[PDB]
Design a protein around this ligand. Structure first.
Ligand SMILES: CC(=O)N[C@@H]1[C@@H](O[C@@H]2O[C@H](CO)[C@H](O)[C@H](O[C@]3(C(=O)O)C[C@H](O)[C@@H](NC(C)=O)[C@H]([C@H](O)[C@H](O)CO)O3)[C@H]2O)[C@H](O)[C@@H](CO[C@]2(C(=O)O)C[C@H](O)[C@@H](NC(C)=O)[C@H]([C@H](O)[C@H](O)CO)O2)O[C@H]1O
Lengths: 367, 55, 55
């Protein structure tokens, strides 16, 4: 009966995988999606065998240097590429009545990179600590590191700037500024080419070396990360299931998945591993976790029904082709409009316009 | 859609050649008389799914 | 004088030529999202002719 009533915690409906989503939620109903992206830089999954792909999985293959100032061709596995994905969500409701709809609104996200522990394997064949007698530790992951990520209701808008516009990237299997823009790179790309901007339309494809989170004047993604240059530089990481972050925006908005898709995107270099063999300096990354908490938010519909309805219904008419009644040579020399009834003017050939707001007895022709 | 789907089969069996044993077999046709009405349902849709289509 | 004045510098350090020790240092660019409003003030011209000119 009155056995003291426990604390009120929010009630979980059901859990499991994406399908759980399928179930009608209601409206305040929240969803937590834990997922993760594997780090994709260089050696791709596919050669599952540790012989053929020598399981350099999640590893820059080797480091394809360059001929000299003139020729820089980097291998396609000497190229850590932005890792990402998109979550497909249910569709929520309408009210064409109030021309308003609800959308999947991301709010906070816990995230974490895992495997920092792995960087403690110090046997194996890496350059030994003491080269001399060939002793020590098989020298750990060291070097530059980079970690960035984002979350959004549409893919990530990026900008590329490269070190050398002359780099011989392949036209094949990677998206380069060229790949996006036909015309080879110029010095501008090399610094801030307002042209050289793409989208995250692909994956494990645009390499980080090129593409960057472009602060479009506009954005529905929240991103961040950082660079930590250097050659010896030690790796550092953060283990914690304690912290949540706010994908929330300044008006208390956070992203909203237009296209019921949630978009994760990130990158995680810990630095290079180095073969005892030679200075085959290939770099490593770790996978990242994500815990997105999104709600249902009501939003004023952007574009007016009618328009769409009828924008559609008109694009169905047969196509016509025929003489120009618009363009630069409209065969229309004229158009007036009236609604009112002023009494007879004076000058009949008077003109009349309304502009930016106001309607005027056009200037007596003779300015 | 506004579709009425009829579907069937009617194997009677083997017709066998006064020859060897080419059992090539016969079927017959079928007739249908569907009696149907007009019923109100709740629309299973979100019209602005086209707005979603747009996005 | 209706001018927004942006200014900055972003030296990242040097790139050293596989050669001799030439060191050319690299820079990077900078985004800016200036948030600005309109504010009210007092007319300064009322400080008359010789009363504030070469004063
Ligand atoms: C698989 C292989 O070894 N291919 C040769 C290339 O050498 C390898 O290049 C890879 C990048 O493409 C890696 O950097 C390799 O490094 C590792 C590796 O992971 O594979 C690093 C490992 O530490 C090491 N493992 C061990 C235990 O030592 C491995 C190991 O050697 C192998 O896994 C096998 O055991 O090596 C690195 O060795 C070599 O770079 C390529 C050149 O490729 C291209 C290019 O520049 O992209 C391909 C072009 O198509 C070609 N041009 C034409 C017209 O074909 C050019 C051209 O030949 C070149 O510019 C002139 O030399 O080369 O060749 C492979 O033979």
């Amino acid at each position: 009966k009155a056995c003291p009533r426990p604390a009120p915690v929010p009630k979980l409906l059901i859990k499991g995988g994406m399908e759980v989503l399928d179930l009608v939620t209601g409206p305040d109903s929240v969803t937590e999606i834990e997922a993760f992206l594997n780090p994709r830089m260089g050696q791709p999954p596919t050669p599952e065998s540790l012989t053929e792909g020598g399981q350099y999985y999640g590893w820059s293959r080797g480091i394809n240097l360059a001929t000299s100032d003139t020729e820089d061709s980097p291998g396609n596995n000497t190229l850590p590429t932005w890792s990402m994905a998109k979550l497909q969500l249910p569709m929520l409701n309408e009210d064409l009545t109030c021309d308003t709809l609800q959308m999947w609104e991301a709010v906070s996200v816990k995230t974490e990179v895992v495997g920092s522990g792995s960087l403690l394997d110090v046997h194996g064949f890496n350059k030994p600590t003491d080269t001399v007698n060939t002793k020590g530790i098989s020298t750990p992951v060291e070097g530059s590191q980079y970690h960035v990520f984002a979350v959004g209701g549409e893919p990530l808008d990026l900008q590329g700037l490269v070190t050398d516009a002359r780099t011989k990237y392949k036209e094949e299997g990677v998206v380069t500024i060229k790949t996006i823009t036909k015309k080879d790179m110029v010095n501008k790309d090399q610094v801030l080419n307002p042209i050289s901007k793409a989208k995250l339309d692909k994956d494990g494809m645009y390499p980080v070396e090129i593409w960057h989170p472009d602060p479009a004047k506009n954005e529905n993604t929240r991103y961040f990360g950082n660079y930590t240059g250097g050659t010896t530089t030690p790796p550092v990481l953060q283990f914690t299931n304690t912290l949540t972050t706010v994908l929330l925006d300044e008006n208390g908005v956070g992203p909203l998945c237009k296209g019921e898709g949630l978009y994760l995107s990130c990158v995680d270099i810990m630095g290079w591993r180095v073969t005892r063999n030679y200075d085959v300096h290939h770099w490593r990354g770790l996978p990242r976790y994500f815990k997105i908490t999104l709600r249902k938010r009501w939003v004023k519909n952007p574009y007016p029904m009618a328009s769409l309805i009828s924008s559609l219904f008109n694009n169905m008419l047969p196509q016509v082709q025929g003489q120009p009644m618009e363009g630069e040579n409209t065969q229309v020399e004229e158009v007036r409009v009236y609604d009112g009834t002023e009494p007879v003017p004076g000058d009949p050939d008077m003109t009349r316009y309304v502009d930016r707001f106001g309607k005027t007895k056009t200037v007596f022709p003779g300015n």
